[PDB]
Design an enzyme around this catalytic site. Structure first.
Site, PDB file in Angstrom:
ATOM      1  N   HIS A   1      -8.280   5.046   3.777  1.00 54.45           N
ATOM      2  CA  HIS A   1      -7.697   4.969   2.457  1.00 54.45           C
ATOM      3  C   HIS A   1      -8.496   5.842   1.466  1.00 54.45           C
ATOM      4  CE1 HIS A   1      -5.461   0.797   2.780  1.00 54.45           C
ATOM      5  NE2 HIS A   1      -5.603   1.264   4.013  1.00 54.45           N
TER       6      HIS A   1
ATOM      7  N   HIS B   1       0.710   4.650   1.209  1.00 53.82           N
ATOM      8  CA  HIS B   1      -0.115   5.253   2.233  1.00 53.82           C
ATOM      9  C   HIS B   1      -0.306   6.736   2.044  1.00 53.82           C
ATOM     10  CE1 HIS B   1      -1.445   5.683   6.584  1.00 53.82           C
ATOM     11  NE2 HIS B   1      -1.285   6.900   6.132  1.00 53.82           N
TER      12      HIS B   1
ATOM     13  N   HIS C   1       0.848  -1.215   0.000  1.00 51.50           N
ATOM     14  CA  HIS C   1       0.000   0.000   0.000  1.00 51.50           C
ATOM     15  C   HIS C   1       0.864   1.238   0.000  1.00 51.50           C
ATOM     16  CE1 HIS C   1      -3.259   2.768   1.121  1.00 51.50           C
ATOM     17  NE2 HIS C   1      -2.775   2.973   2.342  1.00 51.50           N
TER      18      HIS C   1
ATOM     19  N   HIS D   1      -9.442   1.904   9.177  1.00 51.46           N
ATOM     20  CA  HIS D   1      -8.923   0.998  10.217  1.00 51.46           C
ATOM     21  C   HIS D   1      -8.022   1.714  11.192  1.00 51.46           C
ATOM     22  CE1 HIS D   1      -4.868   0.633   8.379  1.00 51.46           C
ATOM     23  NE2 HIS D   1      -5.496   0.681   7.195  1.00 51.46           N
ATOM     24  N   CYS D   2      -7.879   1.142  12.396  1.00 56.56           N
ATOM     25  CA  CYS D   2      -6.818   1.563  13.291  1.00 56.56           C
ATOM     26  C   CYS D   2      -5.478   1.194  12.663  1.00 56.56           C
ATOM     27  CB  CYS D   2      -6.983   0.846  14.643  1.00 56.56           C
ATOM     28  SG  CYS D   2      -5.698   1.436  15.793  1.00 56.56           S
ATOM     29  N   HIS D   3      -4.503   2.118  12.751  1.00 54.61           N
ATOM     30  CA  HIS D   3      -3.186   1.890  12.174  1.00 54.61           C
ATOM     31  C   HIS D   3      -2.154   1.329  13.160  1.00 54.61           C
ATOM     32  CE1 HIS D   3      -0.237   2.024   8.930  1.00 54.61           C
ATOM     33  NE2 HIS D   3      -1.043   2.712   8.136  1.00 54.61           N
ATOM     34  N   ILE D   4      -2.604   0.878  14.351  1.00 55.79           N
ATOM     35  CA  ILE D   4      -1.801  -0.047  15.179  1.00 55.79           C
ATOM     36  C   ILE D   4      -2.062  -1.413  14.514  1.00 55.79           C
ATOM     37  CG2 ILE D   4      -1.590  -1.078  17.475  1.00 55.79           C
ATOM     38  CD1 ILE D   4      -2.596   1.736  18.550  1.00 55.79           C
TER      39      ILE D   4
ATOM     40  N   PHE E   1      -9.978  -4.494  13.905  1.00 59.95           N
ATOM     41  CA  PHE E   1     -10.451  -3.095  14.117  1.00 59.95           C
ATOM     42  C   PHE E   1     -10.502  -2.346  12.759  1.00 59.95           C
ATOM     43  CE2 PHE E   1     -10.008   0.327  17.725  1.00 59.95           C
ATOM     44  CZ  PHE E   1     -11.341   0.471  17.822  1.00 59.95           C
TER      45      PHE E   1
ATOM     46  N   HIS F   1      -6.020   5.218  19.728  1.00 61.90           N
ATOM     47  CA  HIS F   1      -6.034   4.530  18.442  1.00 61.90           C
ATOM     48  C   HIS F   1      -5.925   5.550  17.301  1.00 61.90           C
ATOM     49  CE1 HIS F   1      -7.333   0.814  20.366  1.00 61.90           C
ATOM     50  NE2 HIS F   1      -8.220   1.524  21.028  1.00 61.90           N
TER      51      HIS F   1
ATOM     52  N   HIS G   1       4.133   0.442   2.622  1.00 62.36           N
ATOM     53  CA  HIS G   1       4.266  -0.652   3.579  1.00 62.36           C
ATOM     54  C   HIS G   1       3.508  -1.866   3.088  1.00 62.36           C
ATOM     55  CE1 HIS G   1       0.216   0.167   5.421  1.00 62.36           C
ATOM     56  NE2 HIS G   1       0.508   1.472   5.447  1.00 62.36           N
TER      57      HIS G   1
ATOM     58  N   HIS H   1       0.677  -4.510   3.243  1.00 58.30           N
ATOM     59  CA  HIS H   1      -0.702  -4.459   3.697  1.00 58.30           C
ATOM     60  C   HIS H   1      -1.323  -5.849   3.680  1.00 58.30           C
ATOM     61  CE1 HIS H   1      -4.288  -2.428   5.071  1.00 58.30           C
ATOM     62  NE2 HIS H   1      -3.877  -1.211   4.713  1.00 58.30           N
TER      63      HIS H   1
ATOM     64  N   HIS I   1      -7.182   5.604  10.303  1.00 54.30           N
ATOM     65  CA  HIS I   1      -6.729   6.005   8.956  1.00 54.30           C
ATOM     66  C   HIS I   1      -7.780   5.566   7.927  1.00 54.30           C
ATOM     67  CE1 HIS I   1      -4.402   6.377   5.289  1.00 54.30           C
ATOM     68  NE2 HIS I   1      -4.293   5.064   5.131  1.00 54.30           N
TER      69      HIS I   1
ATOM     70  N   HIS J   1      -3.895  -4.187  16.076  1.00 50.61           N
ATOM     71  CA  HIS J   1      -5.334  -3.980  16.205  1.00 50.61           C
ATOM     72  C   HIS J   1      -6.087  -4.295  14.949  1.00 50.61           C
ATOM     73  CE1 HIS J   1      -4.572  -1.064  19.830  1.00 50.61           C
ATOM     74  NE2 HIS J   1      -4.084  -2.284  20.038  1.00 50.61           N
TER      75      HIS J   1
END
Ligand SMILES: *[C@@H]1O[C@H](CO)[C@@H](O[C@@H]2O[C@H](CO)[C@@H](O[C@@H]3O[C@H](CO)[C@@H](O)[C@H](O)[C@@H]3O)[C@H](O)[C@H]2NC(C)=O)[C@H](O)[C@H]1NC(C)=O
Ligand SMILES: *[C@@H]1O[C@H](CO)[C@@H](O[C@@H]2O[C@H](CO)[C@@H](O[C@@H]3O[C@H](CO)[C@@H](O)[C@H](O)[C@@H]3O)[C@H](O)[C@H]2NC(C)=O)[C@H](O)[C@H]1NC(C)=O
Ligand SMILES: [Cu+2]
Ligand SMILES: [Cu+2]
Ligand SMILES: [Cu+2]
Ligand code: NA
Length: 499
Positions: free
Chosen positions: A402, A67, A65, A452-455, A463, A397, A110, A112, A400, A458
């Site tokens: 897309h 980002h 991806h 989604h949460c970008h941790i 998430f 949290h 990164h 994905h 993010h 998670h």
């Protein structure tokens, strides 16, 4: 050297020791972080990704991806596995061929797929502006002024329990740093400046989890860009940067020639700076080659506060100046229990058929789409509001979206909304208990866009949801290349999957 906008990118396994501890990794371009991919605004990027992975302990499939890049008309190139493509299998390659109209700033790339980017597949992605409105504020802006902040783990990602509080073993600044336990005096990164010059420092969080308190002893930092969006100048002495966020700041090399600590304190893992953890070195040309002796203050008197940021351009806010003042006003119920996250009562588990391919095969509405309950349709050419009230365990949290940036109408730790001039960005902390962080955007980009949460731990624990934006126009807006159409047959044959 930077690579791109047209380049090959090989994805390999190799041993690395960025904190003195050797472990195998998943690397782009043979390094951690991967090489910087760069071009100018409006360029055609063609990144032909060669999957050369053979170690199954970090997954031999991959997907990448880009980002923060909107992918308008190229949703198939966005990268999230099982949302916009099936993964690329080992020994195969795939050309991510897209354009970046109307965007210029600091991004990153990164993996994905699953938690694979934690195992090393992360690097900077910079879209320069030949007519940058901020150009006169600095002298130097190049590969030497990119600063990456990364969490690094000694345990491989596919050995991290799902839904667990997972903690790193080192903070890496430009790929180097020291381990929190069994600390060894392994090499620290050096960022070199010339007395009197001004630098556009491009600060990129490539984190899988922690947020960092970032500062430079003796120096302050003048923010001019937030997640790709030019800002009014805002001078601060500390930046709390959440996973996947970016800032450009002007660094004025206006202190005495010498060595100064660069600090990045994560919210979990090692606290402080003993043994040179959480540290890098700012060195002025002509300084002695030795570690800094500088001190942090006990408290920082001008920390970044997100409501202080404002766009350089007159971006405003779409919709009407009150809660629910949008064509499509949403409130997500964000929860955690028993090792799994949920959004609106549903924990995300990737489908067998990517969401985009389900839509191109004729699925008519969001209730026809899999996973059931994980896809929300959005109407075209409409103002969307999404309230993201915090409280779920494992905060704060960073959410993010897309395909889009968004106005941050309400920020963490402040109950007052801003319908006039908030910053626009792509990844936002939703804060703490009782907060109601709220975003707005307009739907002018047909396709399925992950939220989604970008941790990354998670996301793996569920998430996430998919916004299926303008389902009826998805197929006409996003013509697909044959190599994309070939991905799911190849992947499913290799994995003995029926579809
Ligand atoms: C965050 O802000 C959102 C708005 O952006 C708040 O949403 C509002 O939430 C209330 C309930 O908490 C909603 O009222 C309820 O509606 C149902 C019918 O749908 C009704 O049965 C209940 O008696 C109650 O009236 C409201 O529709 C919704 N939107 C608004 C007011 O615009 C949300 O509460 C805020 N969250 C936090 C934690 O502050
Ligand atoms: C909590 O968030 C709110 C909303 O983002 C922040 O409120 C905003 O505060 C700014 C800065 O003081 C206000 O702008 C000011 O307006 C007058 C012109 O009317 C100008 O003379 C000042 O120099 C400044 O530009 C802004 O109006 C206000 N907005 C709202 C909706 O209240 C608030 O500052 C944040 N709280 C903290 C503690 O940071
Ligand atoms: Cu991302
Ligand atoms: Cu993204
Ligand atoms: Cu999270
Ligand atoms: Na407006």
């Amino acid at each position: 050297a930077q690579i791109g906008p047209v380049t090959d990118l090989h994805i390999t396994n190799a041993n690395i020791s960025p904190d003195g501890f050797s472990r195998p990794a998943v690397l782009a371009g043979g390094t951690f972080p991967g090489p910087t991919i760069a071009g100018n605004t409006g360029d055609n990027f063609q990144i032909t990704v060669f999957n050369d992975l053979t170690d199954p302990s970090m997954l031999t499939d991959t997907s990448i991806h880009w980002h923060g890049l909107f992918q308008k008309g190229t949703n198939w190139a966005d990268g999230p596995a099982f949302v916009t493509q099936c993964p690329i299998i080992t020994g195969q390659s795939f050309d991510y061929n897209f354009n970046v109209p109307g965007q210029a700033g600091t991004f990153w790339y990164h993996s994905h797929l699953s938690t694979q980017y934690c195992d090393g597949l992360r690097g900077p992605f910079v879209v320069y502006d030949p007519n940058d409105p901020n150009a006169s504020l600095y002298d130097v802006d190049d590969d030497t002024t990119i600063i990456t902040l990364a969490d690094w783990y000694h345990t491989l990602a596919q050995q991290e329990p799902i839904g667990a509080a997972i903690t790193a073993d080192a903070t890496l600044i430009n790929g180097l740093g020291r381990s929190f336990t069994n600390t060894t005096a392994s090499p620290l990164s050096v960022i070199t400046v010339q007395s009197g010059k001004r630098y556009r420092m491009r600060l990129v969080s490539i984190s899988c989890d922690p947020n960092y308190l970032f500062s430079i002893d003796g120096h302050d930092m003048t923010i001019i860009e937030v997640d790709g969006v030019n800002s009014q100048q805002l001078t601060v002495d500390q930046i709390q940067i959440f996973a996947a966020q970016r800032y450009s700041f002007v660094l004025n090399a206006n202190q005495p020639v010498g060595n100064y600590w660069i600090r990045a304190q994560p919210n979990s893992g090692g606290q402080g700076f003993d043994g040179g953890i959480n540290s890098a070195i700012l060195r002025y040309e002509g300084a002695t080659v030795e570690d800094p002796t500088t001190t942090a203050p006990t408290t920082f008197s001008n920390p970044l506060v997100e409501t202080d940021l404002h766009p350089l351009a007159d971006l405003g806010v779409p919709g009407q100046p009150f809660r629910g003042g949008a064509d499509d006003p949403l409130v997500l119920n964000l929860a955690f229990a028993n090792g799994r996250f949920s959004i609106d009562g549903v924990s995300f588990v990737p489908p067998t058929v990517p969401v985009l391919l389900q839509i191109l095969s004729g699925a008519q509405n969001a209730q026809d789409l899999l996973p059931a309950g994980s896809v929300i349709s959005l109407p075209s050419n409409s103002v969307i509001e999404v309230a993201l009230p915090a409280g779920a365990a494992g905060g704060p949290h960073p959410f993010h979206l897309h395909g889009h940036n968004f106005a941050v109408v309400q920020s963490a730790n402040n109950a007052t909304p801003n319908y006039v001039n908030p910053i626009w960005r792509d990844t936002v902390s939703i804060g703490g208990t009782g907060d109601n962080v709220t975003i707005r955007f307009t739907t002018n980009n047909p396709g399925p866009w992950f939220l989604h949460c970008h941790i990354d731990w998670h996301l793996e624990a569920g998430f996430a949801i998919v916004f299926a934006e303008d389902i009826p126009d998805t197929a006409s807006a996003n013509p697909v290349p044959q190599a994309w159409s070939d991905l799911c047959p190849a992947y499913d044959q290799a994995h003995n999957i029926s579809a």
